[PDB]
Every structure is written in structure tokens, then in C-alpha cells.
Point group: C2
Chain length 301, copies 2
Amino acid sequence: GFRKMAFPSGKVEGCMVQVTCGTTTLNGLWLDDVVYCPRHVICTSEDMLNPNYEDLLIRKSNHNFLVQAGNVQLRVIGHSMQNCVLKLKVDTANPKTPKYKFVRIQPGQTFSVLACYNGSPSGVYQCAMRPNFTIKGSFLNGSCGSVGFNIDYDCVSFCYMHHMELPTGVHAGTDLEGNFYGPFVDRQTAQAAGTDTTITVNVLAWLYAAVINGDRWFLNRFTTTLNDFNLVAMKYNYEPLTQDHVDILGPLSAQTGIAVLDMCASLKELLQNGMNGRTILGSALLEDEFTPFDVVRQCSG
Amino acid sequence: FRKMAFPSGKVEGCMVQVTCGTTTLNGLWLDDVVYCPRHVICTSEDMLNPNYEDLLIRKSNHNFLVQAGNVQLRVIGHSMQNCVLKLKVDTANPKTPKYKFVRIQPGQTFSVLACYNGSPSGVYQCAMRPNFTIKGSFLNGSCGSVGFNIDYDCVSFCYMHHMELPTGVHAGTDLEGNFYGPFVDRQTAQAAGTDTTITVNVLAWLYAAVINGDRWFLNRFTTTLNDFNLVAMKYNYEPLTQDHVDILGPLSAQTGIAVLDMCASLKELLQNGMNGRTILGSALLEDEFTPFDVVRQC
């Protein structure tokens, strides 16, 4: 019944440009009179093992940057670096600039990715930030600078800019202020993600969704403390819950009348006893890629 | 490996709200014409056996309220093509993309832009099921949402949403207003024919699993096309045509796995199951990726 559903991408499509240094092209995000893109656009292959980005930037001038919306050049009139992002001031304000914010998401939150190549969008899909600060994208060469976002009312919240792939095939990147999610750095080195864990808050959202749809065999008469639940959760490679997780489950708890800690007791029993050949929402597997917000969208609209 | 939808901006620029009485749904505004489901002209007294020709002749242009955002468009004419109402308006949409209307085949995929009150809400990839239903996420007010593919800068519209079935799947028309499947735009509980699994798509997805390093299900056995098809049909899988085998060529080459070798692996999965294992995260074989879908994303 539930599917991965992305936000409509049009407001973000109208902000995508390409940024080229020499023969190296990646994507950038054009908002008002600033283009945002990964700073490694200024790298050569020789620079990539461990670039001195500050040194590489001093040698760059505005006239070294080719910014294009489609085939139309956007003149660069200033440049600066903010953490791992390059900001290129341009001489034209993007007429399609939406209302927007830059947000830094928490692990477990979902967002839409507009996968782009040479400034042109190819596809849109929903991603979850894993607890180890990686995402399972579909990113090919040339996808850097593609962004992740959520849309609230008229307003686009940009939360992710793509920078790299890890040996295991997962992906890593920054917020739009250039700060990486997780311990990663933008160098052509092999870097390891932490062991991943299951996104507990999303599993709980899934159980609430099951209840909303009349599937509630797993509810019990008991409760737990948050600390007790977290200590058990960790033994099953589940993420510990935070206070923010408890809070964002508030609406679903209200919709069902099931206290968060009571659902935690139900989940604890599932982890300790298994499913015993039973299904939930038609699956023998628990799903962790739907947030409480995702559930409410697809259940209540 | 995840489902990927087409970027929806070209379609978002065409969505409007259409209202008649106490019924509101979505319309598609292309040039100076707005397309929408004709059941916008129904009421509760009509929905069970609506004589749409009688209902439509009794309507005036001024009974139709069309809003592009905060701007009302003036309806200067109306007509009906099968189950789609066509409202001529006095302004052309400058955001009209290059477009075509197509009727898709069962097994083909398309992107759905789900809308409510003329406002886009979500985008996702669907397949036209062999029984001509689609497994959508459509709520009250989603009617007139459209499905589409994009090729070059050209949008091919293939689906407009009309109804839900008691099993939770959905049914709709092409943009000429002809339903996919044996369904009717009346307020009745309708069942579909027996569904079948889209075999060529399952094979494409197994190839995707292989390209992604998942390969526990491969085997050295092989099979003929006909013997595979006999087993497929026993499990309510579509038989594989030679065209379908041809279409899988590029994925065969890329991975070096003969199509009929992948058929032999799928056969083993049908007869044995997956025994707790998963493929690309799923406990179930997925059939809503076409070979084209897999290739483009690889």
C-alpha cells in the first residue's frame, strides 16, 4: 500500500545549472544571484587525492568559472568557499527562485533527490539519510551537485548536495552550507561508513501506519521506559531513539491513541520474539524508510 | 536500486483545479484546452448510473470553475471525448510543453504526478498491470492527476486518474478518455481480472540485482524459452516473447548472462522461493522496472 513518493521536482528543476572548470563539469544550484556547487569542481585529477582547496581557490578568478543554465552563460562576479561548497555570485537573479530554506536534516529523515547531469534533471526519487550518514542514491559520474530537498507548502527546504561515493556503493554529501553529513571528506580516498543500523523511529511510524489500516495483532498491554527500549534496540542493530524521535511520533500517537512507549514495547517484543510467520502490512520484513511525515502524507493526505 | 520518476516540472506547469457544484478535481491545461475526468459533472444522485450525455447537455460553460492557482480561467466551450471532458478556455498556457497523447501497453511504466485541488503533491513511478490496474497512491480529490513519460523535451501523457477498486488498486483512462481495462466511471465496487506478474520486468530487475553485486540466485542450469514459459504461466507470470528476449539483450551483454540463463534462475526462484533471502532489499520479486528503466539508470 505504501510506496516511495518524491516531492514534485519542478521548483528545483528551475534552479539547476552546470558549473565547469576546464573540462570538469558538475551541477550547481542557482538561487537569487548565487550559484552553489561542490568545491571539488576546481580540482584536477592530480589534486583529488588530497587537494589544498584554499590554495586551489587563490589561483582561480571569476573568469575561470563557466556557469550555464542550459546553453546560456551566467556571468560570475564573485566567488567564495564555505566549508565544502563553492558560492559563485552571478550577475542575474534567478527568476525561478522559489521560496527556500537551507536545512540540515537528522539521520532517518527522508528527502527527494533530483538526479542531474550537466545541469539537466534525469529523475527524482526519495532517499532516507541512514544512521551512519550515508544515502543509497542512484548517482553516476557527473551527478555531483545534485540536491536533496523537501517541500513544505510553497517553500523548498534544501538539505543535501551530492559529493561522493563510498566503496560499499553508498553515497555521501553535505548540507547547503557545505558541512558533510558524517565523518567524510571530499578527497579521492577510500572512506568507510560506520556500520549501518535500522531507523527505529521509521519502523515505529510503520507500525503506527499498520494500526491505522487495521493491522494490529502486535499490540500488547505493556509499556517500557525509553532507556530500557534503547538498550534492547542497540542489541538488535536498531538506532536508539532521541527525544526528537519521540516528538515527531506525536501526531501518529494521537491519531491511534497508542502512546509512543507502548508502541516501543510492541516493537521490543517483535525484536525479541520475531514475527512467527506473521506479516505486518503484508510483509514479513519491517520497513524503515518511511518517516512519520511520510506515513501521514500517504494515509491522510 | 530504487524506482525513479521523471522530473515533473513540465507537467506541474499544466495542472489546474476544476470545479462543478460541490465536486472539485484536477485538470490538465494544454494550449487553450483543459482536460479532466467527466465525472466532475456528477452529483450523489447521479454517481450510480450517470447518463453523461444527458448530464453534459444540461451544463453551461459558466457552471465550470477552472482556477490556475489564484486566477480563474473563463470556459468558452466544452465537449466530451469518452470519459474525458474538454474545456476550452480563452487563454493559452505558456508553460505548455511539447507533448503527445499515448496509450501505453500493459507492462510499461510511467510517472504519476499526484495532485489535489490543482496542486501537485507527489511524484512516483507506476506500471500498467497486465489486468489494466495500477498500484497507485491516490486519495480523495486525486482525480485528473496524470501519468506520463518524457523523451527528449517531449511529454507523453498516458494516464488520467478516475477511480479506486475495493482491493486498493486504481483505474483510469488515456487522454482520449478510454479506460484501461474493463472499468466504468460509475460509483460501484469493481473487480479486475486476475493479475499476472510482468516477467520481462522481473528479469530486468534480476539483471539490476546482478549489476549491483547481488547474485546468490544465479545458477548454472539453463532452460528453453518454451519450458520457462510453461513454468511461468503455472505461477501466473506472463510468458516471455522473443521480442522481450531481444529487449533484454543490452542487459545480457552488460552482465554476460544469457537471457535464458536468467530465466533458469527465475524458474528456480518461483519453484523454491527465496528462503528468507532478499534481492535488492526485497523479500518479493519486483516487476515494475522495465528493461529501459534499468538501463537508463545504469
